[PDB]
Write a protein that binds this ligand. Sequence first.
Ligand SMILES: Nc1ncnc2c1ncn2[C@@H]1O[C@H](C[C@@H](N)CC[C@H](N)C(=O)O)[C@@H](O)[C@H]1O
Length: 271
Amino acid sequence: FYLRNFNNWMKSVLIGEFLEKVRQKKKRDITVLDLGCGKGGDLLKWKKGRINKLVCTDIADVSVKQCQQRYEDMKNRRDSEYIFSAEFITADSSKELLIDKFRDPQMCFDICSCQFVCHYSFESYEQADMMLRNACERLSPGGYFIGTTPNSFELIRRLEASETESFGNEIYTVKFQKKGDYPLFGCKYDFNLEGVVDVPEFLVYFPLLNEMAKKYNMKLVYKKTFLEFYEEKIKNNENKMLLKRMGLGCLSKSEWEATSIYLVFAFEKQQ
Ligand SMILES: Nc1ncnc2c1ncn2[C@@H]1O[C@H](C[C@@H](N)CC[C@H](N)C(=O)O)[C@@H](O)[C@H]1O
């Protein structure tokens, strides 16, 4: 609950910062790609952002349709006077070109949001490159590719400090297959969060992600650990009060250990 809620706060502040960056130029017709949208847990953040068009895509067809129904549920509120239009696409973004699936092949995006997703595409080089292409190729110049991914530096640091192939606490466990072997692609580990799931992830060496993004003319805006990001954004008072409205003034030490494995990143498309 508290970890989910804290990640929502991180996504709210992150989406909020870059919606305003986009609006500090074009306030009109803001088009967003939500790569790996999941069950639609970001729809209300895009609604509060007052965007115009949202493309939600996920690999699980089940999730895409609950995301589509959740959007239809939202637009039948009385609160949804001008809710964004949306399309919902089932696709493997690490294997399929998404513009093959758009109703408008030539559409452009101001933001691509890829939250807790891109580390599933580092199974191989072509999959990581395909996801970057689906995320960045159709970005308008000056548009943003933002997202959250595990920090490989902090992952390895804790794995070496451990004396087994595992580490964690009562909230989470990370189990690597072998210690001391960290290939750029396919470095598989299992991430278990006590409550939620058990899904295999791949290590993302961020300098590599930074270099591959250059292929689509992306320049790194910033890269922060979850702790660096929290400490910086908590100084803005409306961020601080959003934290208190969401009931996040008291995260456990065990929850900080879990959430401090992650980083946020932002790339911008050049002219
Ligand atoms: N290659 C892939 N292409 C598209 N979606 C994927 C892919 N791999 C995993 N996903 C989906 O990415 C999502 C990962 C979730 N942790 C993120 C959900 C949502 N974006 C959130 O921030 O809450 C899941 O819904 C996956 O089904």
